[PDB]
A and B are shown apart, each in its own frame.
Chain A
Amino acid sequence: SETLCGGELVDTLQFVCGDRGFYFSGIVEECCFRSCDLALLETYCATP
């Protein structure tokens, strides 16, 4: 019923893939409005 963006998105993002770095190519259109899962938060993180 509820979502994550604000202070709670700037940390989970650098949690789920941590030390690879990442992008917004973007996240904030989905996880502010629709309820994302922890699959989508993987695929918006930078592939090595």
Chain B
Amino acid sequence: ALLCGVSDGKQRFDLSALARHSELEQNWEAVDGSQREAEKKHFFINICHRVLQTGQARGCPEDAAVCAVDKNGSKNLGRFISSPTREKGNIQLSYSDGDECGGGQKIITNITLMCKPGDLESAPVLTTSRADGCFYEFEWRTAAACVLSRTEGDNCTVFDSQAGFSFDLTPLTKKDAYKVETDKYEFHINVCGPVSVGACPPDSGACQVSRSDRKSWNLGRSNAKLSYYDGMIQLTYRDGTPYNNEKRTPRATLITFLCDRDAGVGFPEYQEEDNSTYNFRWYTSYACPEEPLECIVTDPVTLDQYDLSRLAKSEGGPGGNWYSLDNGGARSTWRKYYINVCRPLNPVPGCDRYASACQMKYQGEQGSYSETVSISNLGVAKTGPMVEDSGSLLLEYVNGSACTTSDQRRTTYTTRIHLVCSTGSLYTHPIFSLNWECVVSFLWNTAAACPIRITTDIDQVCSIKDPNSGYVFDLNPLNNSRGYVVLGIGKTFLFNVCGDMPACGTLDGKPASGCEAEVLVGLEKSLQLSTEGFITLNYTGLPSHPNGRADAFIIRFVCNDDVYPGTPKFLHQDIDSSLGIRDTFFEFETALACVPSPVDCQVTDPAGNEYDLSGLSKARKPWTAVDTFDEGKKRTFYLSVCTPLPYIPGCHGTAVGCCLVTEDSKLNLGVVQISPQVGANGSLSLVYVNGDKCKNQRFSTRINLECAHTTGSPTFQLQNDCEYVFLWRTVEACPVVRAEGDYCEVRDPRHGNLYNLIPLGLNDTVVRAGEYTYYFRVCGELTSGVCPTSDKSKVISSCQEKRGPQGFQKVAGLFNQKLTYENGVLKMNYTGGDTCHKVYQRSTTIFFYCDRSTQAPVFLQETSDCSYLFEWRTQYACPPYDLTECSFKNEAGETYDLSSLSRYSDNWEAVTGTGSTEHYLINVCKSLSPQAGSDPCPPEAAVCLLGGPKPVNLGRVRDSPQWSQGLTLLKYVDGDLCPDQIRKKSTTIRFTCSESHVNSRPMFISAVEDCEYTFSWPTAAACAVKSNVHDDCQVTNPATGHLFDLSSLSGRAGFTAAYSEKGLVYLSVCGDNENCANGVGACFGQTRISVGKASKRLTYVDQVLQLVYEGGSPCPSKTGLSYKSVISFVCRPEVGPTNRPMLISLDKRTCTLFFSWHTPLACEQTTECSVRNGSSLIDLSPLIHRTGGYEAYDESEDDGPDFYINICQPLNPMHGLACPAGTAVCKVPVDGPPIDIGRVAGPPILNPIANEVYLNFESSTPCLADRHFNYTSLITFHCKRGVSMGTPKLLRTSVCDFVFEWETPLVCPDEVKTDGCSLTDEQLYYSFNLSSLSKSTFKVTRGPHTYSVGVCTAAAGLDEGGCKDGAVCLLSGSKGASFGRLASMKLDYRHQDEAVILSYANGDTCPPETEDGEPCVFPFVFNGKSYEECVVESRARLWCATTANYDRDHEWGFCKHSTSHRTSVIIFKCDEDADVGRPQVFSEVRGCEVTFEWKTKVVCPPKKMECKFVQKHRTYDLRLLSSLTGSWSFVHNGASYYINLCQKIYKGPQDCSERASVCKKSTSGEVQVLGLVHTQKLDVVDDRVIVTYSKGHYCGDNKTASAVIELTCAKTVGRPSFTRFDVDSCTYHFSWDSRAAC
């Protein structure tokens, strides 16, 4: 049989070792035990031709090579009379008739072979059936039969192009080790890399150590030669250590790999050892070939194919994928994104296999180094192209690594990659967009992704497929309807190709090719190609040789580009009458046959009149032709020349030449192959073909071009037999002429002069434009710069450069010492630099126009030939001036000068009437810039008429003579002979004011052929004054003659405005920035988009500078607009770190980029808001909000943040509330913008009657009554104490007068000094004047800070001096703020502690916090500099940083400013050691409420005491009953009562404490001491004299004892004693009678 090995076009597969051919064992038990009931585990399959008979295989019906055994008996499922076949990427066995089905289906068992290299054990399973047991499909994973035999490999790749199963192992390596566990020997191995342990000789690749005995033996040196085997991955090593053998057998080792779907990199496994060839099998997921997910998606809604075939980067790819960058912020959070389409990666070190999109970051990249490390790995190539809205193609991967989505459940990363379609084909990377809740977006720009017609399966014999990219061409345009006459060396043969011929067409089979070749026999057609110099077609004829082929000749077809539909041209003929075959062998080619492209379409004639149409190809706006049609909607033709259009949705095809769009249907008309007719009395016509519709009469387009004098736009001529002819006339169709020279000189421009350029080539030229930078020198031998890095003796003329990532200097073309004057332009060709993508040689081309000496050039677009374009406007290339100053600046209000309205490149042909047969070429004071268009007007003329009759002069230039101040002020002497034949044409120009950013031409008015014409230009350029007061960035205040100058910050360095996390805005004041293009003040993030051009006309409005830029980038809005920006400056009366230009809002009305800023440069007025009140200076400096505003709230309503209040500065700007700059008070409405309800007017005024301080604001808005603009609002102030420095509140509302009320403790007047610094209390009845502690500035220092404190005394003293009115100052850091105002001193007594609290209030602000409330560490370093306060840099709001170094940790949360000001609290402690001690440092609760201690006697001292008392003027004297030493004792109920009045204890008992009034000596209970004499209060009742004694024992819930005594009048001193005592009141009574009581 031996029909069981299949070979494909280049490779072979064999099923040889899988099949048990006559070896007589158990066959494949092709079963896993999941469901079996009759246990029909048969499936005994030999592959080629065998059944082997043993237990459950004996009695198999053979001659089938397939067993179906059971309990019920034995069957045949399949025979082998077929051969194995090829499915998609598999081998398939279609097996034959085994035994019959129930319905006689003749059972067929399919077997699929999927290869899995490193499979010794392979048992297939019946996965699927037909559900009815007569069609058995098997899946087999074998080692066998997917590849040819072995091939040796590169550095660590098995890279083979033909077999195409090209593995790689390079991520398996590890610089640490791999540790293997046997009992007494480990095995130490790193694949493709050196052994990395010290016990081993490090020359090795692997070595085993005896872990019982620590003995090293070399198991071979490292190796890189990868050796694919047939089904195996063999890797083997070098010689190493011999044992004992006389052959000195060195220990070699052999490594094998088995594929696994989900193992990963795995562990190496000691297999065995047989004779010192060491064995290591391995399970690595890398050793396994993946399947390409099929990437062709059809169309659900219409019929249009797609194609994502050629984008998958298959090979050559060690990090050679599609890669996409992200620059953003600085040397942290940079990412480089790796991604591949429709298949997993060419494996990258340390990402994955079965991943598609690796995130991969930079580390130590600086200086051409260290591409990668790996951070996060996501994606699985699962779905394929899920199509979208007819051009855009969504594409999703899933099953990435874990992440979080705003505290949701943990899900995967998810690549989306949008593929919008475009026409710019080669070398377009994805462009990185987003990293937003674990949906990493991308955005592709271009493939040939979008346009694939289904082709409706047209199968015409004239139509052949092209499977290179996907194309079918059509030679139906060779339906040549009057025949052709072929050349012939025997005789002229006659020929058409398909479907045409009448002249030889009266035969059987209807011949289109069989003609006489005499002075004949029919030939049919069948055809083919191989796309390799080869597009052919046979011609099968009827009079065949018997059992042979008839007369059937071939026509090879290759492609020319610049020729007609063509001419068959007769390659050699040869008649052979001996053999029955006879072939004419005629071979021609035409242009119209091959792959359409951008055709580079400079083309010429035999008559030597060269042409170019590439003056029209550069049109970003696609061309349009005008039409004529019926009462319905008019049609629309799009049209381009030599270059296709951008993806108009709904006209498909490959080269969209001309897309006819009506409202209803979209007709593709043409493709791109150019051949203009050049032999005629007429001119060019270029042709577009292959409409491929219209009843086998296919569409075509041929737009016809004749030369006009002016610019134009095409039109619709007619339409016939569903082709078109247009008409189009412009300048370009005139026969162009150019001349050639040498050594940067040229000659003879039709003017007889020379052209020197070597002054421009004197020094280097750097064009620092965009992502690239070009070092190049004019007239070659470029030597300077950082690119002379080459060895070969060839000269460097131009070489480009990059920034850090793979910064390359590939050299452009070499010096060839040439330029050419080409139609008014000077240009050089610099050919032959090093290689581009495929084959392309970098050429550079440098242009020149002649202009007013502006010698800074700029690069234009990149061509398809990898070339670079450049452009200068120098002052060299224009010889023949007739120039005047053309002005009268002698008197003002005169339209003094007309300099900027001259022109030298080309010239004004006026806005003439509709239907001008004439062309009025005129410029203001220059004599006709030479247009290169046609037979020109002689350049001595300045006013000229072309169109219809000859170039005729109408006058020569002369310096401006006026007739009036206003009008008729240029005049042209000496035009040609008038009908009088006396005088010459004397023509005058007038000018008139308008405002027009692009004005019109001088509008042609009058015509009297006798020597007189007038022209009047409605201009923008007539009325102004050239002495605008400075016209540099300095302005003068009209009010008080103050000068505002700003040129101290006019850098080219620029600035940074933040609009995102990852995007900056560049900004430079009254000058052009260096980052973005020239003529740009400010530019955006990734591509440099202009916002407005740099002007220096700095105006001034209302204590604010309003610098204006205009005329920036095209805006997307419904009306055609540009961006503009108003950098509005505010007085900042200090210098802080936050003085950088914050982008404040965008306005969507007319595309306006608003911009706040600050400086101290801009305030004329010294800002003071502090006024006098007799002897008292009052101030409102600390009540300025410094970082934002304050908010006066929503009032008198509900369900609404209504007012913004800022006292004597203007308010600090805040992203996204466009309250226009320099506003004190701002109303936020519920609709439309906020409103300027006043600006800051002047100093606080008083009210001399009430003494409550006003302050006023005037406005620049009208009232709601239109009453004499001057919108007013004024604020009051109210003295009232408390901690909070208070808010504004709106109280009273007039129609245009708002009144804000205010509560604040600042305007409270300082009284006469105080009453005293003394804790005067009603309760203890004796004060503590701390006037003693008013000494001087203390210095308490604890933790990382010091302090400076002072009681009843401010100390802006020895250290800083600026702690103005600061009673408690932080002298640590630099300029530490104040804590509590000395006027705001609130001395306090704490009852239970019996200690004095000193409280201060309303200092400066408590330091700010993050939004999250995790407070900041404010002495920190950003970018090397240190800062204290929340900086604005590279984010759009204020932010602190919550680590000591933002360069190290990257923790920050936005600076949400508190309204809680700082404060302090001091405690004093009774200590007998010293009267005055030391303050101490207790706590910083979020670092503002800092509290202080003391160690004093000054607050305690009851020592000098008067216990005498008077009530109702009834005096006493009690100095007699005191006992200064000892006390009278009485001990009843075991309690010893030692007491005397207004004393200490004196010679008292044991264990009763210091300054004791009563100490009871108890029997079983504890000694307690109760009562004190400093809070002692004596009073006389009608009868009794009473006294109290507090601070005893703890009675109950914060209750103490008190000995309230009874003093009844008696004659002699007695003794008191104890009456009763309870637990609720804890009161003691004493019944004393004494002589000295009354």
Contact = CB atoms under 8 A, between A and B. Distances in A.
Interface of A: 1-16, 18-19, 21-22, 24, 26, 28-29, 31-33, 35-39, 41-42
Contact of A10 (B443, B1114, B1151, B1436): B443
Interface string B1117-1136: 11010000000000000000
B1084 interface: yes
Contact of B1148 (A2, A29, A33, A38): A38
A10 B1118 contact: no
Interface of B: 388-392, 416, 418, 420, 422, 431-434, 436-437, 441, 443, 445, 620-621, 647-649, 1059-1063, 1084-1087, 1089, 1114-1118, 1120, 1146, 1148, 1151, 1436
Nearest to A9: B443
Given A8-B1087, A11-B1084, A37 B1117 contact: yes
Contacts of A22: 434, 436
B1060 A29 contact: no
B420 A32 contact: yes
A28 B418 contact: yes
B1060 A2 contact: no
- Going nearest first, the 4 A-B pairs with the smallest beta carbon separation are A21-B436, A29-B389, A18-B1060, A28-B392
A37 B1120 CA distance: 10
A2 B1063 contact: no
A42 B1147 CA distance: 12
B1116 A28 contact: no
A41 B1116 contact: yes
B1063 A14 contact: yes
B1061 A11 contact: no
Contacts of A7: 431, 445, 1086-1087
A32 B1070 CA distance: 36
A6 B1086 contact: no
Contacts of A24: 416, 418, 441
A39 to B, nearest CB: 6
A21 B434 contact: yes
A36 B649 contact: no
Given A5-B420, A38-B1116, A10 B433 contact: yes
Contact of B391 (A1, A3, A16, A29): A29
A2 B1116 CA distance: 9
Contacts of B431: 7, 10
Contacts of B620: 2
Contacts of B1086: 7, 10-11
A33 B659 CA distance: 14
Contacts of B1089: 8, 11-12
A4 B1116 contact: yes
A4 B1089 CA distance: 12
A7 B1117 CA distance: 19
B1116 to A, nearest CB: 6
Nearest to B1085: A11
Contacts of A21: 434, 436-437
Given A15-B1085, A29-B389, A32-B647, A37 B433 contact: no
B1114 A2 contact: yes
A29 B1061 CA distance: 28
B1118 A37 contact: yes
B1151 A38 contact: yes
Contact of A38 (B422, B436, B1063, B1115): B1115
Contacts of A9: 443
A12 B1116 contact: yes
B373 to A, nearest CB: 26
Contacts of A42: 1148
Contacts of A35: 1116, 1118
Contacts of A32: 391-392, 420, 647
28 contacts: A1-B621, A2-B620, A4-B1116, A8-B1087, A10-B431, A10-B433, A11-B1063, A11-B1084, A11-B1086, A11-B1087, A14-B434, A18-B1436, A19-B1060, A19-B1061, A21-B434, A21-B436, A22-B436, A24-B418, A26-B388, A26-B392, A28-B418, A28-B420, A29-B388, A33-B649, A35-B1118, A37-B1116, A37-B1118, A38-B1151
Given A7-B1087, A24-B416, A37-B1117, 9 more contacts: A4-B1116, A8-B1089, A12-B1084, A18-B1063, A22-B434, A28-B392, A32-B420, A35-B1118, A38-B1146
Contacts of A18: 1059-1060, 1063, 1436
A39 B418 contact: no
A26 B441 CA distance: 14
A5 B1148 CA distance: 19
A14 B436 CA distance: 12
A6 B431 CA distance: 9
Contacts of A38: 1115-1117, 1146, 1148, 1151
A5 B424 CA distance: 13
Nearest to B422: A6
Contacts of B648: 33
B1116 A31 contact: yes
B1373 to A, nearest CB: 32
B1146 A16 contact: yes
Contacts of A10: 431-433, 443, 1086
A5 B423 CA distance: 13
Contacts of A8: 1087, 1089
Nearest to B421: A32
Given A6-B445, A38-B1148, A15 B1116 contact: no
Nearest to B436: A21
Contacts of B1117: 37-38
A35 to B, nearest CB: 7
A1 to B, nearest CB: 6
Contacts of B391: 29, 32-33
A36 B1116 contact: yes
Contacts of B443: 9-10
A7 B325 CA distance: 13
A5 to B, nearest CB: 6
A4 B392 CA distance: 15
Contacts of B388: 26, 29
Nearest to A40: B1116
